[model samples]
Target: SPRRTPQSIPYQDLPHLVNADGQYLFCRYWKPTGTPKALIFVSHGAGEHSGRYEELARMLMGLDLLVFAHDHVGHGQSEGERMVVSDFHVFVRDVLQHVDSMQKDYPGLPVFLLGHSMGGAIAILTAAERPGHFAGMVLISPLVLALPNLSLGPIDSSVLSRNKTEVDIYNSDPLICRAGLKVCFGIQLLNAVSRVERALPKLTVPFLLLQGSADRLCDSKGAYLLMELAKSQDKTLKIYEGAYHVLHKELPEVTNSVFHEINMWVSQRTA
Candidate 1:
């Protein structure tokens, strides 16, 4: 008997990592044709997998950058129960391990962090763990201040984006964890928010934030908190009015803007 993903695929057949906890973590890497200039590690949101970042990674790919991502424990093709984690630190720990491994493989390359929602929270802590490790960070509607007390209802898939087609895709995607997040997971997020705040005041990494004003899963204020609380001298925040949670997969115009902002930011810094 061998370890398998939630989709029933054998981990032995995929490019994956075994975490400190001995869990299989499915990984994806987008290496450029020529020598890569920098590294971008993507942290996907809660209840979602790394594959959702395909379009975003492709955009970064053409930029002569190497982008990599992986499913956290208990999500996607990674080992564990759906949307469950013993502690949120497991995410940060796994990301750091993967990032370190990549840095060793590609020595002297600048590394960046790109995260969405809960992933965004993980991104901050990861960067915080090694203050001088990342070149820059990109956050899409990060869960900066999600209070456990405010989360009471069932998970709604409709509000992710205004585009109905995108919503439908989310609804139909078999890899997506459509079930409501469990109570233990809910408390972990609150703990993450607390940990993120502790790291914010002294956060020195340059970063870009793309947030939708109408985001329900994560409040627009969360982005503002990062912009204000984080001591980064080169932080920029862009607000997409009336948009929803997932900016990368939002309406066409907004999505393009997001990619453009990321492209321009990383492009300028790499040189």
Candidate 2:
């Protein structure tokens, strides 16, 4: 059946029904036959869309699980200026709002969240604030740790959000990154020190953190910091010796190790 990864559930994209700053909140879903055991929602990192997570979603779907993911405002197939934000919590709120919608669609299934980089910061914030909404969480190369000498509050709230001019977040010419850049960079800074550094323990879900030793963008130690904050009884922190920022894409072999580890984790948890 062509209905899992390269093939997904005969699913549909849903709207949050309310517009955030003139943009409709959108999410992609994979629904299984009966009531699903869990709903896995994902948020991507900076400068990428929800499509990049299709591969991982597919993997989860093969296990007869339902999956959901959405493009954050200003990224992916959603609305707003890319890589730009005036208030970071606005996006965080949007993610929460969508989770509410998922609860409505599938009532009792345990909910899980997986976020990478910037999304990881959002995941942690959401989990910290509303610990009961989700069952477990996973962060890959999470950008939740401090950068040693930076403050994210002013730049994101004052500088980027107010800028009227639009800039490209990823100047590499990927059609996926054509939104406002300054605000985006400002958001990155906010997540850098505030989101990760001040992280506190609240949620009790099991966590799986993947990091590469060679990761320069978000230091691999960020993974260790996250592990320390997570208070889950079942948690694992795995490192790829020479891997870089992008866990799965940057290094295939190491990513395969991640896949194996994640699959094993899923097998045990989902059993």
Candidate 3:
């Protein structure tokens, strides 16, 4: 029998978690230089893996926020069919797995959620699963609304960013699932949206949303919908005028401001 491997590396050397279905999920942790003020659990989008978030995670590490993430089943270095999930709860269940695992390592440290695109929906549904568990949440281009409504713009990375080169470079990365999202995956995402609407009423944690006004992948309407549905005493949604979907790698002006605002917002709550 062949041994299990990711990136040609054995799971023995890397940190990973097996989901309820017994598939290994790869993990990444950006531990800050010193003792941390809190933990930031990152949830990545569909068709992407955890490593794409390093830029933001590296910045958060400077703030002494222990940023941690794991590849979802079937995507990236993780085991599963690419972009195909049998049940959406499988996503939330795995998110909690890493959070709980880390909670044991640094007990009493407040943990926050950061997510983008489909990851946004996972973070919301995750936060909903455990009321009062997260200190705050930040979302970018979450799929809080139904599908399409977007360009119907089926394929092509252009819709994901205005920073064309960055998009092109990252698109060539091996970990990225460049396949057309499958039939079952589409239904799972819609199911995820309905769950988010149901979970919206339970979202009482302090939260922030950074939405690109010109984003074609997800409309600003979803951002506005979240701002209204949340009952948190502190809720803010900042709109980026000309930014596109992956605000993580948006062009310089918008990109710099996005990080600054996140640092500002996260520090306020963590402090």
**Considering every candidate listed, which one attains the maximal TM-score?**
1
What TM-score would you give candidate 1 relative to the actual structure?
A: 0.96
TM-score of each: 0.96, 0.77, 0.94
**RMSD in angstroms, all models?**
2.3, 9.2, 3.0
Please give, for residues 1-271, the per-residue lDDT of candidate 1 as tens digits: 9887878898889999999988889999999999999999999998889999998899999999999999988888889877777889999999999999999999999999999999999999998888877999999999998633243455777789998899998988888887777777888989999999999977999999999999988999888878989988899989999999999999999999999999999999996
**Position 270, candidate 1: lDDT:** 99
Better of 2 and 3 by lDDT: 3
User: Which model scores highest in lDDT?
Assistant: 1
Instruction: Give model 2's TM-score versus the native structure.
Output: 0.77
Residues 34-75 of candidate 2 have per-residue lDDT tens digits of 657677878788767677676677777777778887778766
Task: Record all residue pairs in model 2 with backbone atoms less than 3 Å apart, i.e. clashing.
Answer: 4-7, 82-179, 83-184, 84-184, 86-161, 144-196, 167-181
Give the local distance difference test score of model 2: 0.66
lDDT by residue (tens digit), candidate 3, 246-271: 88788988889999999999999876
For candidate 3, the C-alpha RMSD (Å) to the true structure equals: 3.0
Using TM-score as the yardstick, the better of models 1 and 2 is 1
Better of 1 and 3 by TM-score: 1
Q: How close to the true structure is residue 105 of candidate 1, measured as C-alpha lDDT?
A: 94
